[PDB]
Amino acid sequence: HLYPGEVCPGMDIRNNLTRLHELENCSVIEGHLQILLMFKTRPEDFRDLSFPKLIMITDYLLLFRVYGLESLKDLFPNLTVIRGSRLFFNYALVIFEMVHLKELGLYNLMNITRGSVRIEKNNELCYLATIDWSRILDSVEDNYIVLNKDDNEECGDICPGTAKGKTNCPATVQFVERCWTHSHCQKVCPTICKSHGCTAEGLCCHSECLGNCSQPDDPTKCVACRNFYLDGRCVETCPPPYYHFQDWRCVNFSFCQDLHHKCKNSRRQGCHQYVIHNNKCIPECPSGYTMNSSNLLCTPCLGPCPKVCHLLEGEKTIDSVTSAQELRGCTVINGSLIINIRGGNNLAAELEANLGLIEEISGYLKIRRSYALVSLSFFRKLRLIRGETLEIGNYSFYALDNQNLRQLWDWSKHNLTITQGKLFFHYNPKLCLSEIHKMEEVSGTKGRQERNDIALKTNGDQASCENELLKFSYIRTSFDKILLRWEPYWPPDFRDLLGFMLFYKEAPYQNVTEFSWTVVDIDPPLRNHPGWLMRGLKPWTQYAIFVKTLVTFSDERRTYGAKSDIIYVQTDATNPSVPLDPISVSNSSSQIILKWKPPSDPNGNITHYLVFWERQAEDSELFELDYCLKGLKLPSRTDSQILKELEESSFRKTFEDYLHNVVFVHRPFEKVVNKESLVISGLRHFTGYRIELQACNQDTPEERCSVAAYVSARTMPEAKADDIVGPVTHEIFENNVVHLMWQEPKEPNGLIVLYEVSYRRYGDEELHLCVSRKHFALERGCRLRGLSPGNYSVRIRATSLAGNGSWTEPTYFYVTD
Amino acid sequence: HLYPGEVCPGMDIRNNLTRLHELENCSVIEGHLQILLMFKTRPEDFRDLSFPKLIMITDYLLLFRVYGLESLKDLFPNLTVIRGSRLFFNYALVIFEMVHLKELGLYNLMNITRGSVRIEKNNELCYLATIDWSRILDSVEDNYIVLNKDDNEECGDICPGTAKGKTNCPATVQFVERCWTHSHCQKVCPTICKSHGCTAEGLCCHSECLGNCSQPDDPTKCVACRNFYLDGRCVETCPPPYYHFQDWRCVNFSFCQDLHHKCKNSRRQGCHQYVIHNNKCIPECPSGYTMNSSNLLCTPCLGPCPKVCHLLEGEKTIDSVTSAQELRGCTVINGSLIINIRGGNNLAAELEANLGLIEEISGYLKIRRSYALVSLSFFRKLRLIRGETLEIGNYSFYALDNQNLRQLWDWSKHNLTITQGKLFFHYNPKLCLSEIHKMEEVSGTKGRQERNDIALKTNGDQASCENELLKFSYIRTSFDKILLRWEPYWPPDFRDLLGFMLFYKEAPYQNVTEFSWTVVDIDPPLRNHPGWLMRGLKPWTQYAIFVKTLVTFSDERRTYGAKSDIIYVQTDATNPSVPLDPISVSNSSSQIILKWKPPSDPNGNITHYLVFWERQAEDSELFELDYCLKGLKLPSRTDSQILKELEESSFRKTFEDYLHNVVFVHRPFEKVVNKESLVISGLRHFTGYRIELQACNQDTPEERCSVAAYVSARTMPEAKADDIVGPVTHEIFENNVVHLMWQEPKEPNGLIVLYEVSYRRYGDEELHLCVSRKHFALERGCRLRGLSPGNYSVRIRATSLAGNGSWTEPTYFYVTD
């Protein structure tokens, strides 16, 4: 009971109202309701149309360009709740371009479980601002209501009550009215119940009811079930032996089994092979599980487990990787496959990932005009071709007009078989007959092929199918060049040899398979080991080299020629480049940190670095030239943007190039090992130092390595070393000739630039005086003259390259009056 | 005189000082002086080295990593001016990474004509901040002086004068000294002369001297010539019969002629074929001119005129378009050409532009492993191959291992000949023997080719060389589909036919040459005109279709098969899409402008538009429902961003798709022709209008076209139409029953929502009152009661949907007391 009708799967009404009355009985839609493209329909047609039994909708509702529809108050008078199991572009209710629509009329919808509402292009619709979307939908932030008649202030939304003081329903927030139509207005239950709903008297329903109820506190009287529906009784969870189905109703095993039976054979278009798992009738077994036909339980399959991908009409054409995406993970293909890859990028890897798990093809495989393919290696696991379905002429393998196809599979490792039909190969220039004969002997189709089945004049013609072997004889290397030699091969008829080809490329690893190369041709020898010499190689790199002959195509038995094996050759090393960014920082009196970067061109492995730091004496003129005479200086020793960027970069690159073809051949030094930083200790304070830096790779056997990079730094001085020590003695010979004998700061910051002497009469002003190095040396101190007799005090300060010093303690001294 | 030595071309000193003394005599360098990579050099080596005669340098000066060089005061003691004719990376003086360098010493350089100075990485160089670059170089804004010993305050730059009051040279701007070394300091001439210079006494030189002079006002005593040098006499312009040479000196015809004689044969590396033009010995004739061997004048050559491009060692390999750029504009190639184009983009057009002007190849042409080439059409003007140089085997044309080569040239239009040697073709799958035989008959090489010269088994095998013709029999079109038929062709042996191929592509123009396509295969008929039906076409487009047979390669005489001619087929038209963005704007009482855009899918040519505008009556409830009762409303009728953008775009695209496969079949209207805008006239003021808009393409023969797009608008009202007209009459029946008989605004803005009446006692307050439509209709005016007797005035205002009106004139009226 609880539903007079059945459940109707969602449909797509279009272009005729005769399909709309299919809902004459059913009350719940376990699909989506879409009504669109209704042009000839007139408003008089909707006057006598209603679906009062429709209550529950699972997925969503869509309306688009339905002429003659004025309001839904009659179409869906009892639509209670939209479950929103599957959303339409993240929308559970879409109303788009609904001309002639005046008002919604959905006054019986209270709950929308998922999604938002998108109403747009409704130039006639009114009654939108009078809707409490907060009470209807839990999360209203995803709404979209624009370009309507209520966008501009034009809708006179009037709902019952105003003639009697605005009764029959309340307002909410500014306090604004909420109403659905001109006759029916929105109903809001008390907040004391979240979503169970309330009756007319306001009494709340049972916790299991959703939206509406008939008798308060009765799970058997709900109209909608919050969790699951069961024989007219809402329940939180379906007890055994019932399984939750479609997220809203509970079913027995028999129904799911019958649906699966329908889906096997008698359900072609998009049926779901329902299997029971985790007490849920899921449409399909999830990842890492398999379906067992006995009872349809998603048992965890061990390892790769079958995923049969039945093809539509038994034929699929793979043009690009996107078409292969739909086939991803399919191990067995129940049909025939066609490959027509004309172009793309980085193929044979994504294709291998998507299709490598294929293990069987029921029908036939056909490779046709696949220009970008180079090999069929991407069919990693392909083992057997059933070939139950055969093309015209009873063909199982069809290869045609492949330009770059060079091999099918490695037949020293791979196994394959074909049951029915015969092979076919035409217009495959780069595929020799050797693989075709491997197919006749391996696939067991030797007795099946007949005349004209395999083209003997268009397949093995332009291909490279050398069978003999070539051995390198003399190999020597160098820092730049490489000389190569091999045994002189001659075909049975010497006139049929055109020359050799040499291939080489950068080989960082050893995973080179020859499937991007530099080709160099070599003339035949004059009937003397033929060879070639390289010239443009980069030092200390591994190279992959192999030589292939080139023989003309005589009409007689093919002289297949010889191609050597792939070998790896490593170039020698040379002296590295200059280390980059040498920066020196002083943080102590004798500790200077040094930072740098590895050279841009190591040209080998950098075994050790080399740092030379030498003490630099101070400048000569700082000694014999005065710095306090009139006129001096304190020796305080401490697209245009893109175009200019390219110009500067090219200038720097030009100088780097100049540094790269130079053609190479008692100071305290330390060899840094595997470290890019170095500190120094035991240095004189505040002294200029010249730092020469080198990078090196070879140490013991006649060591030779890079050229030097220079940088300089000065250590931090000592604030104490410049202080004056010793009593300041005074002596006058005849007439106030003040001689000042006092010790010099024999440990200064570099040197003593000048002295300053200041003296002051008691209660009088102090007068200062300079003392130069030359004057101090010649006088062995300072000489003062023209001073009035009395008692004075002397303040002496010393200056160095660091800066001004500290005045000594004022030793007051009295000259006779 | 004026120069004891000759002029030395600029060189590149490197790795040994033995090349430096080559300047023992010459005094002017008409080149560039670069000294770099001097490692083993010691400072003692520079002690006894000087070049006092060097005065004038034309291009620039470069120093880089010259160990042992302390200062240039001895190297270049008389370098007066650097002309800077050709700059090094926009720098006329580069000093980079000069270790051991202390000071510049260039105290005799005054003028730098062009470029700036770049001094960088000089951790020892000082005397930089004491340089007046403004006086030296005219434009100093391009200087670059960083990362030196003067960047940090570490150089005590001291220059003579301080011991004697800073004399012997002045300062300039803060006022700062300018000096070159510790012994020689910069000399600045008085501003009264711009650049002619001054002597020791300050007297200015002649206007033609540059930098320095010996006797003031003497053009014959200058050291450098401002404009041009001539036999020790500076001159503004060289008079005839002398021509300006190298921008600084004048020469006779004999010298330029001898230089050209040296250049033609006995000058291999980079000589300039000097020709006299416009009184200048230019290195080469400019664009649009030619060289005549009689007198070497750049006469204007008529039309394409020869530009012979002699090749280095007679062999050039073209790998990419960049390699072809160097050959651009060359009409005759004196050498041999090799083509090895392996890849690229949009080839055969840029290559044709760069190389299409070639008219002759002296040596041989060789196309080898050119995988990306499709035809030799880019050799537009190639006519004759001289073939004086032949490879091994005496070959002139060498084509080898070309995968996509399909034709050489069209031999109904092109002409070609080859003098010496024989042809060669091997491993050209897509080139049939027909063109090779065309070559044997056209080039005149039929008698030269011998056995094994042309491969008969590896050229015309995989190619498409159909010779017969196919004629279409039945062709009919549709709006979407196309059905095609042709005459049933059968080869001589019916078993050798595999099927037909059909090609079609979008064909906007008719310049289709079949050289991007969609291929569809067709099975042979059952021995009944074979044909195909199309399904995925876009309406109203022109299609290029041609059918090519596919016949197996029998061992007997080739059944070449038949390919039809390229034909152009145009699909039918259908009803267009909806017009985009319909916007309506009101700017008058009856004028409303309308704007829109053409439909996105015209599906033909839009002959005319269709606009339907209908008057909409006002809402019904506005009449019978009061709007002034207690409780009312004034009817004031007026990466997540990327993901959401893609979601919205896909939603719109889904609805457009829904609109695209609909499968199609008395109002005042007007057909707009070839106009996207429309205005309307003669409309009631402030009335709702519904506008239905359509696009159309077919008019007379059973017209049918797009579906409607809707939009609505309202006209602007009249501020006068709402005014009240007519006297306001009053009458009291028994007891102050004030009846107000006055005319209604029978022409309102939509309708009269309500009236308001206000009356006031003399010197007292005014009280207002509403009047509803129903009350006004039933009372035929207003009724007033409960009013004290006396003299009053009435103010009446009318309201409409536009808004509040204007109160009428207060007509004071007296009721009996």
Numbering used by the authors:
A (entry chain A), B (entry chain B): 1 to 173, 177 to 518, 528 to 539, 547 to 657, 689 to 715, 768 to 919
What does the paper say about this structure?
Insulin receptor (IR) is a receptor tyrosine kinase that plays critical roles in cellular signaling, growth, and metabolism. IR can be activated by two highly related ligands – insulin and insulin-like growth factor 2 (IGF2). Consequently, IR-B has an additional 12 amino acids at the C-terminal helix of the alpha subunit (α-CT), while IR-A lacks this segment. Here, we present cryo-EM structures of full-length human long isoform IR (IR-B) in both the inactive and IGF2-bound active states, and short isoform IR (IR-A) in the IGF2-bound active state.
To further investigate why IGF2 binds to IR-B with a lower affinity, we determined the cryo-EM structure of the ligand-free, apo-IR-B dimer, at 3.9 Å resolution. The overall structure of the IR-B dimer in the apo-state assumes a classical Λ-shape, similar to the crystal structure of apo-IR-A45. The two IR-B protomers tightly pack together primarily through the interaction between L1/L2 domains of one protomer and FnIII-2’/FnIII-1’ domains of the other. This Λ-shaped conformation imposes a distance of approximately 120 Å between the two membrane-proximal domains of the IR-B, indicating that this is the inactive form. Notably, the 12-residue extension in the C-terminus of α-CT of IR-B was not resolved in the cryo-EM map of apo-IR-B, presumably due to structural flexibility. Nevertheless, the residues immediately preceding the 12-residue extension in the C-terminal region of α-CT are well folded and form an extended loop in the structure of apo-IR-B. As a result, the α-CT motif in the apo-IR-B becomes longer as compared to that in the apo-IR-A, and thus can reach and contact the FnIII-2 domain of the same IR protomer through the interaction between Phe714 from α-CT and Asn594 from FnIII-2 domain. We, therefore, hypothesized that the additional structural restraint of the C-terminal part of α-CT imposed by the α-CT/FnIII-2 interaction in the apo-IR-B might hinder its threading into the C-loop of IGF2, thus largely reducing the association rate of IGF2 with IR-B. To test this idea, we introduced N594A, N594R, and N594E mutations into IR-B to disrupt the interface. Indeed, IR-B N594A, N594R, and N594E mutants exhibited increased IGF2- and insulin-dependent IR-B activation, when expressed in 293FT cells. These data suggest that the structural restraint of the C-terminal segment of α-CT by the α-CT/FnIII-2 interaction regulates ligand-dependent IR-B activation and explain the lower binding affinity of IGF2 to IR-B as compared to IR-A.
